[PDB]
Amino acid sequence: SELLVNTKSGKVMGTRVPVLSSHISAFLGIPFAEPPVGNMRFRRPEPKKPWSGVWNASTYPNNCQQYVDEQFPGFSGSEMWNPNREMSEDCLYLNIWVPSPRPKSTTVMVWIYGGGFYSGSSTLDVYNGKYLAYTEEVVLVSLSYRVGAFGFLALHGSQEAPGNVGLLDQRMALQWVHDNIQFFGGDPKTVTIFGESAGGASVGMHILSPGSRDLFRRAILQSGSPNCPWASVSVAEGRRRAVELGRNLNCNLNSDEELIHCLREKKPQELIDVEWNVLPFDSIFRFSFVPVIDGEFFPTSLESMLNSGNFKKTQILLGVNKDEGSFFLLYGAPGFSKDSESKISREDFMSGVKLSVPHANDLGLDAVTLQYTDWMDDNNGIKNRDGLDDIVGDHNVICPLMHFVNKYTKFGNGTYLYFFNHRASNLVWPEWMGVIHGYEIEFVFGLPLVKELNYTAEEEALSRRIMHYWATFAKTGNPNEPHSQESKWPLFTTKEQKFIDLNTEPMKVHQRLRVQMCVFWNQFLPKLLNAT
Amino acid sequence: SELLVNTKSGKVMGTRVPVLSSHISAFLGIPFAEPPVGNMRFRRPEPKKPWSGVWNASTYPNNCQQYVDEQFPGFSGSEMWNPNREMSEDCLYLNIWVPSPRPKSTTVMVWIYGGGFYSGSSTLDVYNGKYLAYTEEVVLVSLSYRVGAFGFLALHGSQEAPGNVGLLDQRMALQWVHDNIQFFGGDPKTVTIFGESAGGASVGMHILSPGSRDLFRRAILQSGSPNCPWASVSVAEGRRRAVELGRNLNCNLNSDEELIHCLREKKPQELIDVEWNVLPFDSIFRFSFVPVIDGEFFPTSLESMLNSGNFKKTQILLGVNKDEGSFFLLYGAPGFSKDSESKISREDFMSGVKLSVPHANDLGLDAVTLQYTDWMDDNNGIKNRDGLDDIVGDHNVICPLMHFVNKYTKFGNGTYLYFFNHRASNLVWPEWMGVIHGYEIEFVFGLPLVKELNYTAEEEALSRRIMHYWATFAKTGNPNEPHSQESKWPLFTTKEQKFIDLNTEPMKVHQRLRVQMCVFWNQFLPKLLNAT
Ligand SMILES: *[C@@H]1O[C@H](CO)[C@@H](O)[C@H](O)[C@H]1NC(C)=O
Ligand SMILES: *[C@@H]1O[C@H](CO)[C@@H](O)[C@H](O)[C@H]1NC(C)=O
Ligand SMILES: *[C@@H]1O[C@H](CO)[C@@H](O)[C@H](O)[C@H]1NC(C)=O
Ligand SMILES: *[C@@H]1O[C@H](CO)[C@@H](O)[C@H](O)[C@H]1NC(C)=O
Ligand SMILES: *[C@H]1O[C@H](CO)[C@@H](O)[C@H](O)[C@H]1NC(C)=O
Ligand SMILES: *[C@H]1O[C@H](CO)[C@@H](O)[C@H](O)[C@H]1NC(C)=O
Ligand SMILES: [Mg+2]
Ligand SMILES: [Mg+2]
Ligand SMILES: [Mg+2]
Ligand SMILES: [Mg+2]
Ligand SMILES: [Mg+2]
Ligand SMILES: [Mg+2]
Ligand SMILES: [Mg+2]
Ligand SMILES: [Mg+2]
Ligand SMILES: [Mg+2]
Ligand SMILES: [Mg+2]
């Protein structure tokens, strides 16, 4: 049977799922590691002990314990991101979508969800791999990893909570793919990992880490990068937040042992409730427990690794969305509303700047503010709002990714950059928010192909176009189909620095993606903050 | 006789000079102070001892000893600024242009030439007061003052060279006007001082200094301001440059007395030759001996005086030219030529930035460079050239004047701001230089009315329009003629901050004159340099 597959860990029973007037094989909820529960909370993952019999992989697995956003109850805009399955520490499972008939050895794509390392699921509707798997005849895998303290609490030195375990749960699933994806008709030698936001960062991080480089062929990074200011913390900061978490839960902070002895006895929700209390500053686009530069998973600092070319050299495709900042302003900046144009007064604008660059000293805040203020019209509400969006977006996503793309292209074997700027005709979020962070996902997973979702023809066209770039890229290391006749997406070069739009209009090649502001964020500001 | 006038210092014999198919009285070379020669070099001025007989005031006086620019020999563009008369320490004279028939008591205008306090003359063709005096029926006075070491060498404490003496020679001439201008048919109670570049600064400085406030009614400042970074130095810097000058001339630096004993024995040219050697940094738009914040002429720092409103409160009219920087780049920045478009390479561009802000530390130079670099097209030659022009212009003239105008309007009794941006159709300087620093002068003095000068009708119109604004303003404290029907030049307000163009096209009202860059220069950069 096509739905029965024997893996090195045991037999698995898939399920035939319908997809666009046809069907395909789906092996959902396959375990790749032992349930990281009890004495195992915070510890690195352990490969799943082989099981006897046939594992039922027909339903979706549970979602890792995480903070659930309830800012907008019943609003599909936000709940589309909340866990749609039961929450449980036992959550290290992976889902697979195999074409039917099963291909012999085709291109595989592994999805690493985002969520700022504090949330995320592999089972969200917007991550349904059938449409992509089916349409571009690829074996699509959707892994999972621990978020929050569970996946990133870091007491460096300790082996009971070494940190980056979540990043390890990812490596393991990627490992399991390396060892078993062949049995599903997927070529382990053509695995392309791709993720968004924290997922994008995670991707870049596996490029960086020596311990992951041989676990994939190519990589796609979406609105995220290893060097994103929120993507990680030092060992000192990590420890500080672990002890702070402890202090928040009347934990014995006298030894790395009993601090964890304590954390392991607390119910998951207890940790989640006091999770954000350990952040250093009042802010936005900052998350409590994230990857830590331990010196093992990350040999040296991310900057030094990027400058020395100490990272996997392959081809990479990546880009950002036009309005990467609105989502975060809506949630944490004063003046923003889901029910109005969100015109920001000069006073809120400044509250936002400070909330956006919490680590900057007053001279820095002044630099930022000056850089994003139109002094000819400083009290324009629309301009302040759009400014904050660019600040948050430029500082947290776009510029860090551009620094990465520039640093990487000097050693890589090919770079393809995009700028998604298409606002869905059915978006439920208000207009002011534009092309929000993460809303390119649905286009990558083919959601516009589902007529019920109420998308427009042109939008179906864009999605089909994107899925193909991604697929073709994962398959050849080049978004462009050979001899093809449409406009070619130029390779990003250190000299030309070309990228393309991603919308329903004819493709436009561009250059130096927001080089002006990124020169500020990547070079000037860093120097100002280090000097002063 | 109309050409004979008895003043409190003695009788003076004027001369009838032709002006635009008519004539007017001109009393040239009238002494207002004792020849600051010998033991008097560097000392404050002494009022001219009354003389017996009739003083021959029919020819122009000598020009103060100064550095003469010989960069472009025989080029009218530069020589129009060099002394056109014999040079001599005995140079404290003033010229007057009285309408004929002699008015009873009309508006007087006193011109203070510029030249960065190191050069300048009252006898230049571009400062011929007949055209303005005749056309707008005003008594036009053109004073003179010591420049260079002679007028500004400062050894604070010493009374043998107290500093600011040049600024005093100005006050004295202004005093003589207060005491005698009535005999020439000029109302001493309606004296409007107006100057350009250093002259503009000097004007603002008489507004500031308590010892000058009662010596004029109104004031016009052109492309210059009291707070211009080059317009003055601290007492410490002043002293340092005096001792440095000494050291340059094998002078005994052991006592303020014999340092001067030495300087007074050196021939003028000897001082001029080593004059620029005392500047702190390699630079442009910086001059050796300039006003010093002594604590007497300037009670406290210029900044504190401006913030506390410690200055004469009257109406003021002022503005700048569009390309205030090209003149200086041509002379001191690498890459510039009088014979080419002057496209500046990225390398020269940076040499220029550093030469333009010699006091800035690397972080500052980075700020400046970042602020004026178009990273989408950083190697555009035309863009770098135009950038340097704005940097020099914004930093040395426009922004300091805007800081001044903003600070002043909060206490003043009326402010009128202009932005001269008309390029003369007969300019001899290359196109790239645009509306050069100081080339609005000819329009203020009516040179376009002289058909031989080969100006265009529209240009004659502009000049006649300017002369009238200046005149009308000096006469009423408002550039606008009552009930007049043309477009009114709006008052500059702290809230509206309106100003007008000054070119051959219909008048356009504007706002926030280069507020973006001036926020950088007036607020951000100062803070960056003080913090780091
Ligand atoms: C598990 O598989 C069985 C058939 O083997 C079937 O009931 C169903 O697909 C799965 N059970 C659940 C949770 O529905
Ligand atoms: C990738 O590597 C191959 C093998 O050396 C080389 O021929 C090719 O030029 C590289 N492609 C790019 C654009 O990096
Ligand atoms: C001085 O006045 C006399 C007449 O009194 C006449 O020669 C001329 O205008 C002046 N002298 C000079 C320097 O030409
Ligand atoms: C100037 O001062 C007079 C006298 O107080 C006042 O009435 C007038 O409003 C002032 N004008 C301006 C615009 O400062
Ligand atoms: C199209 O989209 C909506 C929103 O998800 C969905 O509920 C339904 O399939 C369509 N809307 C309707 C009911 O027409
Ligand atoms: C107009 O201007 C020139 C330049 O100053 C001047 O020499 C002359 O009066 C006119 N040019 C000629 C000779 O036509
Ligand atoms: Mg324990
Ligand atoms: Mg214990
Ligand atoms: Mg926006
Ligand atoms: Mg296709
Ligand atoms: Mg295809
Ligand atoms: Mg002596
Ligand atoms: Mg002596
Ligand atoms: Mg220019
Ligand atoms: Mg007139
Ligand atoms: Mg008139």
Side-chain angles (χ1 to χ4, degrees), chain A residues 420-453:
Chain A
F420 184 86
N421 58 345
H422 175 68
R423 184 195 170 66
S425 58
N426 54 30
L427 234 291
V428 294
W429 292 106
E431 292 298 313
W432 73 259
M433 299 182 62
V435 181
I436 297 129
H437 180 75
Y439 284 74
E440 82 289 3
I441 302 287
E442 55 211 66
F443 284 80
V444 162
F445 284 82
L447 281 289
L449 276 64
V450 180
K451 306 185 186 181
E452 294 80 300
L453 299 175

Short mmCIF file of all heavy atoms in Angstrom, two decimals, chain A residues 420-453:
data_model
loop_
_atom_site.label_atom_id
_atom_site.label_comp_id
_atom_site.label_asym_id
_atom_site.label_seq_id
_atom_site.Cartn_x
_atom_site.Cartn_y
_atom_site.Cartn_z
N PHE A 420 8.15 40.77 -1.24
CA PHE A 420 6.70 40.54 -1.35
C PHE A 420 5.98 41.82 -0.92
O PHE A 420 6.21 42.32 0.18
CB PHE A 420 6.29 39.38 -0.43
CG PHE A 420 4.84 39.00 -0.54
CD1 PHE A 420 4.41 38.10 -1.51
CD2 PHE A 420 3.90 39.50 0.35
CE1 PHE A 420 3.07 37.70 -1.58
CE2 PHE A 420 2.55 39.11 0.29
CZ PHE A 420 2.14 38.20 -0.68
N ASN A 421 5.12 42.35 -1.78
CA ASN A 421 4.40 43.57 -1.44
C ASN A 421 2.96 43.54 -1.92
O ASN A 421 2.36 44.58 -2.18
CB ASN A 421 5.12 44.79 -2.03
CG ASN A 421 5.27 44.71 -3.54
OD1 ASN A 421 5.10 43.64 -4.12
ND2 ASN A 421 5.61 45.82 -4.17
N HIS A 422 2.41 42.34 -2.04
CA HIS A 422 1.03 42.20 -2.48
C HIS A 422 0.08 42.09 -1.29
O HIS A 422 0.25 41.21 -0.44
CB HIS A 422 0.85 40.96 -3.35
CG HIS A 422 -0.58 40.71 -3.73
ND1 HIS A 422 -1.28 41.55 -4.57
CD2 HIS A 422 -1.46 39.78 -3.30
CE1 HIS A 422 -2.53 41.15 -4.64
NE2 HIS A 422 -2.67 40.08 -3.88
N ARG A 423 -0.91 42.97 -1.23
CA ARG A 423 -1.88 42.92 -0.15
C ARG A 423 -3.05 42.06 -0.60
O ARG A 423 -3.71 42.38 -1.58
CB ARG A 423 -2.41 44.31 0.22
CG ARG A 423 -3.35 44.25 1.42
CD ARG A 423 -4.16 45.50 1.59
NE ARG A 423 -5.22 45.35 2.59
CZ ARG A 423 -5.03 45.17 3.89
NH1 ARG A 423 -3.80 45.10 4.38
NH2 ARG A 423 -6.07 45.09 4.70
N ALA A 424 -3.31 40.97 0.11
CA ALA A 424 -4.40 40.07 -0.26
C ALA A 424 -5.74 40.80 -0.32
O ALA A 424 -6.04 41.63 0.54
CB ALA A 424 -4.49 38.89 0.71
N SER A 425 -6.52 40.50 -1.35
CA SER A 425 -7.82 41.11 -1.56
C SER A 425 -8.83 40.68 -0.51
O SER A 425 -9.90 41.28 -0.38
CB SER A 425 -8.34 40.77 -2.96
OG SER A 425 -8.44 39.36 -3.17
N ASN A 426 -8.49 39.64 0.25
CA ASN A 426 -9.38 39.13 1.28
C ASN A 426 -8.83 39.30 2.70
O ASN A 426 -9.42 38.78 3.65
CB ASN A 426 -9.69 37.66 1.03
CG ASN A 426 -8.45 36.82 0.89
OD1 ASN A 426 -7.42 37.14 1.48
ND2 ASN A 426 -8.54 35.75 0.12
N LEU A 427 -7.70 40.00 2.85
CA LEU A 427 -7.09 40.22 4.16
C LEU A 427 -8.14 40.68 5.15
O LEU A 427 -9.02 41.46 4.80
CB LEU A 427 -5.99 41.29 4.06
CG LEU A 427 -4.60 40.93 4.59
CD1 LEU A 427 -4.60 40.80 6.09
CD2 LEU A 427 -4.14 39.63 3.95
N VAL A 428 -8.07 40.21 6.39
CA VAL A 428 -9.05 40.60 7.39
C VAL A 428 -8.51 41.71 8.27
O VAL A 428 -9.26 42.33 9.02
CB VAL A 428 -9.44 39.41 8.28
CG1 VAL A 428 -10.18 38.38 7.45
CG2 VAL A 428 -8.21 38.80 8.88
N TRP A 429 -7.21 41.95 8.18
CA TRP A 429 -6.59 43.02 8.95
C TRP A 429 -6.84 44.35 8.24
O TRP A 429 -6.90 44.39 7.01
CB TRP A 429 -5.10 42.76 9.07
CG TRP A 429 -4.78 41.59 9.91
CD1 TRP A 429 -4.35 40.36 9.48
CD2 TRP A 429 -4.85 41.51 11.34
NE1 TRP A 429 -4.14 39.53 10.56
CE2 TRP A 429 -4.44 40.21 11.71
CE3 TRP A 429 -5.22 42.42 12.34
CZ2 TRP A 429 -4.39 39.79 13.04
CZ3 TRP A 429 -5.17 42.00 13.68
CH2 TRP A 429 -4.75 40.70 14.01
N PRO A 430 -6.98 45.45 9.00
CA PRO A 430 -7.23 46.77 8.41
C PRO A 430 -6.18 47.21 7.38
O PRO A 430 -5.03 46.77 7.42
CB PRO A 430 -7.28 47.68 9.63
CG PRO A 430 -6.33 47.04 10.55
CD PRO A 430 -6.70 45.58 10.43
N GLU A 431 -6.61 48.07 6.46
CA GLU A 431 -5.77 48.57 5.38
C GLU A 431 -4.42 49.14 5.77
O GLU A 431 -3.40 48.84 5.14
CB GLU A 431 -6.53 49.64 4.59
CG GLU A 431 -7.71 49.11 3.79
CD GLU A 431 -7.30 48.10 2.72
OE1 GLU A 431 -6.32 48.38 1.98
OE2 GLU A 431 -7.97 47.04 2.62
N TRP A 432 -4.40 49.96 6.81
CA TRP A 432 -3.17 50.59 7.25
C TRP A 432 -2.02 49.63 7.45
O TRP A 432 -0.86 49.99 7.23
CB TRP A 432 -3.41 51.39 8.54
CG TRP A 432 -3.61 50.58 9.83
CD1 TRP A 432 -4.80 50.31 10.45
CD2 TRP A 432 -2.59 50.04 10.67
NE1 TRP A 432 -4.58 49.64 11.63
CE2 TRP A 432 -3.23 49.46 11.79
CE3 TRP A 432 -1.19 49.99 10.60
CZ2 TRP A 432 -2.52 48.83 12.83
CZ3 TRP A 432 -0.48 49.37 11.62
CH2 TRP A 432 -1.14 48.80 12.72
N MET A 433 -2.33 48.39 7.82
CA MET A 433 -1.32 47.36 8.07
C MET A 433 -0.60 46.82 6.83
O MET A 433 0.37 46.08 6.94
CB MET A 433 -1.95 46.21 8.86
CG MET A 433 -2.50 46.63 10.22
SD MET A 433 -3.19 45.27 11.20
CE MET A 433 -1.72 44.28 11.40
N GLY A 434 -1.09 47.20 5.65
CA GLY A 434 -0.46 46.76 4.41
C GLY A 434 -0.17 45.28 4.24
O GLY A 434 -0.99 44.41 4.56
N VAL A 435 1.02 44.99 3.72
CA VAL A 435 1.44 43.61 3.52
C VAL A 435 2.13 43.18 4.81
O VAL A 435 3.35 43.29 4.96
CB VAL A 435 2.40 43.51 2.32
CG1 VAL A 435 2.82 42.06 2.09
CG2 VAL A 435 1.72 44.08 1.09
N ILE A 436 1.32 42.68 5.73
CA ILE A 436 1.76 42.25 7.05
C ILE A 436 2.77 41.10 7.12
O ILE A 436 2.86 40.25 6.23
CB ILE A 436 0.52 41.92 7.90
CG1 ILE A 436 -0.30 43.20 8.08
CG2 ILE A 436 0.91 41.38 9.24
CD1 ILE A 436 -1.75 43.05 7.74
N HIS A 437 3.55 41.13 8.19
CA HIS A 437 4.55 40.11 8.46
C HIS A 437 3.84 38.74 8.45
O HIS A 437 2.83 38.56 9.12
CB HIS A 437 5.15 40.37 9.83
CG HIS A 437 6.20 39.39 10.24
ND1 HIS A 437 7.47 39.40 9.72
CD2 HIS A 437 6.18 38.40 11.17
CE1 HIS A 437 8.19 38.45 10.30
NE2 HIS A 437 7.43 37.84 11.18
N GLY A 438 4.36 37.79 7.68
CA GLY A 438 3.76 36.47 7.67
C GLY A 438 2.62 36.22 6.71
O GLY A 438 2.19 35.09 6.55
N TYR A 439 2.11 37.25 6.05
CA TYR A 439 1.01 37.01 5.14
C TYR A 439 1.39 36.66 3.72
O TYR A 439 0.58 36.75 2.81
CB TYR A 439 0.01 38.15 5.19
CG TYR A 439 -0.80 38.03 6.44
CD1 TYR A 439 -0.24 38.35 7.68
CD2 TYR A 439 -2.08 37.46 6.42
CE1 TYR A 439 -0.93 38.09 8.86
CE2 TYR A 439 -2.77 37.20 7.59
CZ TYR A 439 -2.19 37.52 8.81
OH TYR A 439 -2.86 37.26 9.98
N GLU A 440 2.64 36.26 3.55
CA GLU A 440 3.11 35.82 2.25
C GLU A 440 3.03 34.28 2.35
O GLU A 440 2.99 33.59 1.33
CB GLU A 440 4.56 36.27 1.98
CG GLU A 440 5.68 35.41 2.59
CD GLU A 440 5.77 35.51 4.11
OE1 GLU A 440 4.93 36.20 4.72
OE2 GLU A 440 6.68 34.90 4.70
N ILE A 441 2.98 33.77 3.58
CA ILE A 441 2.93 32.33 3.82
C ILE A 441 1.83 31.67 3.01
O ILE A 441 2.08 30.73 2.25
CB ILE A 441 2.64 32.00 5.30
CG1 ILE A 441 3.71 32.60 6.22
CG2 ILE A 441 2.60 30.48 5.47
CD1 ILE A 441 5.02 31.91 6.15
N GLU A 442 0.61 32.16 3.16
CA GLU A 442 -0.51 31.59 2.43
C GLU A 442 -0.24 31.47 0.93
O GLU A 442 -0.71 30.54 0.28
CB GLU A 442 -1.78 32.41 2.69
CG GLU A 442 -1.69 33.90 2.39
CD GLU A 442 -2.59 34.71 3.31
OE1 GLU A 442 -2.31 34.72 4.52
OE2 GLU A 442 -3.56 35.33 2.83
N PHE A 443 0.54 32.39 0.37
CA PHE A 443 0.86 32.33 -1.05
C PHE A 443 1.89 31.26 -1.32
O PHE A 443 1.87 30.63 -2.38
CB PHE A 443 1.36 33.67 -1.57
CG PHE A 443 0.26 34.67 -1.77
CD1 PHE A 443 -0.26 35.37 -0.69
CD2 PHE A 443 -0.28 34.87 -3.03
CE1 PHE A 443 -1.31 36.25 -0.86
CE2 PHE A 443 -1.33 35.75 -3.22
CZ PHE A 443 -1.85 36.45 -2.13
N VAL A 444 2.80 31.05 -0.37
CA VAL A 444 3.82 30.02 -0.51
C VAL A 444 3.18 28.63 -0.38
O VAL A 444 3.60 27.68 -1.04
CB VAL A 444 4.96 30.19 0.54
CG1 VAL A 444 5.76 28.91 0.69
CG2 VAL A 444 5.90 31.29 0.09
N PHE A 445 2.14 28.50 0.43
CA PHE A 445 1.51 27.20 0.59
C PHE A 445 0.30 26.97 -0.32
O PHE A 445 -0.42 25.99 -0.16
CB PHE A 445 1.13 26.95 2.06
CG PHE A 445 2.30 26.59 2.93
CD1 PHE A 445 3.13 27.59 3.45
CD2 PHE A 445 2.61 25.26 3.19
CE1 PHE A 445 4.25 27.26 4.21
CE2 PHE A 445 3.72 24.91 3.95
CZ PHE A 445 4.54 25.91 4.46
N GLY A 446 0.10 27.87 -1.28
CA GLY A 446 -1.00 27.72 -2.23
C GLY A 446 -2.44 27.97 -1.79
O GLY A 446 -3.37 27.57 -2.49
N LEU A 447 -2.64 28.63 -0.66
CA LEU A 447 -4.00 28.89 -0.19
C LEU A 447 -4.86 29.65 -1.20
O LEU A 447 -6.09 29.57 -1.15
CB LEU A 447 -3.97 29.65 1.15
CG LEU A 447 -3.69 28.84 2.43
CD1 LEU A 447 -4.88 27.97 2.76
CD2 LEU A 447 -2.45 27.98 2.26
N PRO A 448 -4.25 30.39 -2.14
CA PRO A 448 -5.15 31.08 -3.07
C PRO A 448 -5.81 30.11 -4.07
O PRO A 448 -6.84 30.43 -4.67
CB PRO A 448 -4.23 32.09 -3.76
CG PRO A 448 -3.23 32.40 -2.69
CD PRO A 448 -2.91 31.02 -2.16
N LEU A 449 -5.23 28.92 -4.22
CA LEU A 449 -5.79 27.91 -5.12
C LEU A 449 -7.10 27.35 -4.63
O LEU A 449 -7.86 26.77 -5.39
CB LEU A 449 -4.82 26.73 -5.29
CG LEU A 449 -3.73 26.90 -6.34
CD1 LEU A 449 -2.82 28.04 -5.93
CD2 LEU A 449 -2.97 25.60 -6.48
N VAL A 450 -7.37 27.52 -3.34
CA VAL A 450 -8.60 27.01 -2.74
C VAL A 450 -9.71 28.02 -2.95
O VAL A 450 -9.86 28.98 -2.19
CB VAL A 450 -8.42 26.77 -1.24
CG1 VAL A 450 -9.72 26.24 -0.63
CG2 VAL A 450 -7.27 25.80 -1.02
N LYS A 451 -10.51 27.79 -3.99
CA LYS A 451 -11.59 28.68 -4.34
C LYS A 451 -12.46 29.15 -3.18
O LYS A 451 -12.93 30.28 -3.17
CB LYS A 451 -12.46 28.01 -5.41
CG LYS A 451 -11.68 27.52 -6.62
CD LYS A 451 -12.61 26.98 -7.70
CE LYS A 451 -11.84 26.36 -8.87
NZ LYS A 451 -12.77 25.86 -9.93
N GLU A 452 -12.67 28.29 -2.19
CA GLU A 452 -13.51 28.65 -1.06
C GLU A 452 -12.94 29.81 -0.26
O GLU A 452 -13.69 30.60 0.31
CB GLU A 452 -13.72 27.45 -0.12
CG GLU A 452 -14.52 26.31 -0.73
CD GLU A 452 -13.69 25.41 -1.63
OE1 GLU A 452 -13.14 25.92 -2.63
OE2 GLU A 452 -13.59 24.20 -1.34
N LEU A 453 -11.61 29.92 -0.23
CA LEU A 453 -10.94 30.98 0.52
C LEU A 453 -11.24 32.37 -0.04
O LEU A 453 -10.86 33.38 0.55
CB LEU A 453 -9.45 30.71 0.56
CG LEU A 453 -9.21 29.38 1.29
CD1 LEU A 453 -7.76 28.99 1.26
CD2 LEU A 453 -9.69 29.52 2.71
#
